[PDB]
Amino acid sequence: QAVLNQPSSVSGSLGQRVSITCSGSSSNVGNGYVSWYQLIPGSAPRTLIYGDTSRASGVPDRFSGSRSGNTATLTISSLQAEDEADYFCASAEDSSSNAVFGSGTTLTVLGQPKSPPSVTLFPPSTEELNGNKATLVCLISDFYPGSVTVVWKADGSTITRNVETTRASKQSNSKYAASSYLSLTSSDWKSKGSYSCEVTHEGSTVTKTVKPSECS
């Protein structure tokens, strides 16, 4: 097919500026009509630039496009937390109806304040327990940077099976969220004295505990 080469990822500091390149040939980027798109997970693609330099309606002034030969550049100034996203260039090739997208770039914005995780641990419901199953749900939110490790415990000892933990994903406030699930039988739930969800973030651990016999 054809490839518009972008750096896999780039980073810039808060309030500062960053550039993302888009390298192709003379048959795509050389046509002098490059476009740029912003992708935030859980949201639809958003058009930033078209025709090398023209900003789409509603796009702030701090997004600017340029092109020198067969390499286009997206420049973002005054970086904010909400600019952390994936960015894709694009260009027609051999036809206005044959669009080619770039390999994509992930932008990180450094210098944001660290935020510890808020942790909420839910016990299994009575409804689920009547069907002889028990799911413990550990919801993890408002943490930055967007990486945590989760450890489950029963009566103080590490649980080594039937744990599933999601990846971290970005929230509407540019912090991260994640969740972890412990799948038990109703018998397991009642037998142990306690269960814990331990969430480690930047070397600091937050633990929530529930006690079956006292959960009601």
Add this chain to the structure above:
Amino acid sequence: VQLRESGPSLVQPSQTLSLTCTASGFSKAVGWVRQAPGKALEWLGSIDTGGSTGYNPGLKSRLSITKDNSKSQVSLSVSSVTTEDSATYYCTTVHQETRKTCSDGYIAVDSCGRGQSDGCVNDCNSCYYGWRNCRRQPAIHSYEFHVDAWGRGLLVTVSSASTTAPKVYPLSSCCGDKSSSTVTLGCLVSSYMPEPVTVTWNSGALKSGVHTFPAVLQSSGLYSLSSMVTVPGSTSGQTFTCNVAHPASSTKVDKAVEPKSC
């Protein structure tokens, strides 16, 4: 300008995936873009006002796009699908134009006024008199493409697995487990397939203080997700009902979530 994709969220391998886009606030060329999980945006094709179609060359043999101005809708068809066709499919409005130009400090022979009309030259006088510094080139074509408006997109999963509607369970904290001033309630949307599910609270009337988490995929192949709502201690008399919709199974579930009386 709004675009609305519609179609099945689940299809089996070797089947034909058929999608529809509904346009409102307009009549402009429409295109289809997809993004498979983990992959880049990928062009599929388009159909303009004149009704001419263009496709991603590498996928063309598997694609077909038609339109119906009366119903104000555009269709997409993808044949012989595999798991590689699992993706979010976006209906879009696209700009498509083809401007003939000369590449550099080259100008059309047309504009020189003599030599009539052909291709391109670097300088009218030089190529008119045939001076050694004259440079000629054929006319070149500049192709313009960009996406104006995007639909929110339709998630399509290619799988042979049957649908499984979710079991929805109430989430409430254990007794004694921290009467912080704020209470947290939620719904566990358990053991379904495929994605997605839509969760609202109180029939969508409640949006503030709602936190819906991405799904976890169990090794059983079934998804589970949770949505929680925060409630100030000051609050009283409010009911909290999560409304869970699962398009693949055409199921909608309403679960009332109570704090434990303790």
